[PDB]
From Swiss-Prot, chain B:
Effect of E38K: In strain: Beta/B.1.351, Eta/B.1.525, Theta/P.3, Iota/B.1.526, B.1.1.318, Gamma/P.1, Zeta/P.2 and Mu/B.1.621; May enhance affinity to human ACE2 receptor
Top-level taxon of the source organism: Viruses
Effect ascribed to mutating V37A: Increased resistance to neutralizing antibodies
Organism expressing this protein natively: Severe acute respiratory syndrome coronavirus 2 (2019-nCoV)
Record annotation: effect of changing S31N: In strain: 20A.EU2, Iota/B.1.526, Omicron/BA.1, Omicron/BA.2, Omicron/BA.2.12.1, Omicron/BA.2.75, Omicron/BA.4, Omicron/BA.5, Omicron/BQ.1.1, Omicron/XBB.1.5, Omicron/EG.5.1
Stated role: Attaches the virion to the cell membrane by interacting with host receptor, initiating the infection. The major receptor is host ACE2. When S2/S2' has been cleaved, binding to the receptor triggers direct fusion at the cell membrane. When S2/S2' has not been cleaved, binding to the receptor results in internalization of the virus by endocytosis using host TFRC and GRM2 and leading to fusion of the virion membrane with the host endosomal membrane. Alternatively, may use NRP1/NRP2 and integrin as entry receptors.
Quaternary context: Binds to host ACE2. RBD also interacts with the N-linked glycan on 'Asn-90' of ACE2. Cleavage of S generates a polybasic C-terminal sequence on S1 that binds to host Neuropilin-1 (NRP1) and Neuropilin-2 (NRP2) receptors. Interacts with host integrin alpha-5/beta-1 (ITGA5:ITGB1) and with ACE2 in complex with integrin alpha-5/beta-1 (ITGA5:ITGB1). May interact via cytoplasmic c-terminus with M protein. May interact (via N-terminus) with host bilirubin and biliverdin, thereby preventing antibody binding to the SARS-CoV-2 spike NTD via an allosteric mechanism.
Disordered: annotated segments: 9-44
Protein name (record): Spike protein S1
Impact upon substituting F44S: In strain: Lambda/C.37, Omicron/BQ.1.1, Omicron/XBB.1.5, Omicron/EG.5.1
Region of interest called Receptor-binding motif, as start-end residue ranges on this chain: 1-48
Length: 64, 48
């Protein structure tokens, strides 16, 4: 508990990397109309959160 | 003697920069594995 912050039709893409204890989060939102897979195209994700966790990560799980 | 301050002298690898290790796992010095029990060739990783 070293940190706490409180703030198919849509595509949400994320980048999660942890370098030297810094957890960098990139994101980009766009509307889509496709039910098969990710649409073919190009877009750039932008950083919003840089959280210095200092925590070793080897595995992750997605919550629905 | 203030023995409340601890430091680590047993670890299988050198740390990366800006690393903080809180592992309590028993250091394995010998070839015999240590299944959570310390003793000969099984040492506590922290020193006071
Ligand atoms: C992150 O944690 C993993 C374990 O989940 C570490 O992998 C271990 O590394 C040690 C040597 O330092 C080995 O003796 C263990 O057998 C490894 N365990 C597994 C399951 O791979 C990894 O080194 C850790 N990395 C950091 C940055 O601390």
């Amino acid at each position: 508990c070293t940190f706490e912050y409180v703030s198919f039709k849509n595509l949400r893409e994320f980048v999660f990397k942890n370098i030297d204890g810094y957890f960098k989060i990139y994101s980009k939102h766009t509307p889509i109309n496709l039910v098969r897979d990710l649409p073919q195209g190009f877009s750039a994700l932008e950083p919003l959160v840089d959280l210095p966790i200092g925590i070793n990560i080897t595995r992750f799980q997605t919550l629905l | 003697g203030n023995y409340n301050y601890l430091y680590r002298l047993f670890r299988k690898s050198n740390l990366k920069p800006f690393e903080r290790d809180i592992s309590t796992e028993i250091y394995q010095a010998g070839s015999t594995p240590c299944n959570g029990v310390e003793g000969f060739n099984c040492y506590f990783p922290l020193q006071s």
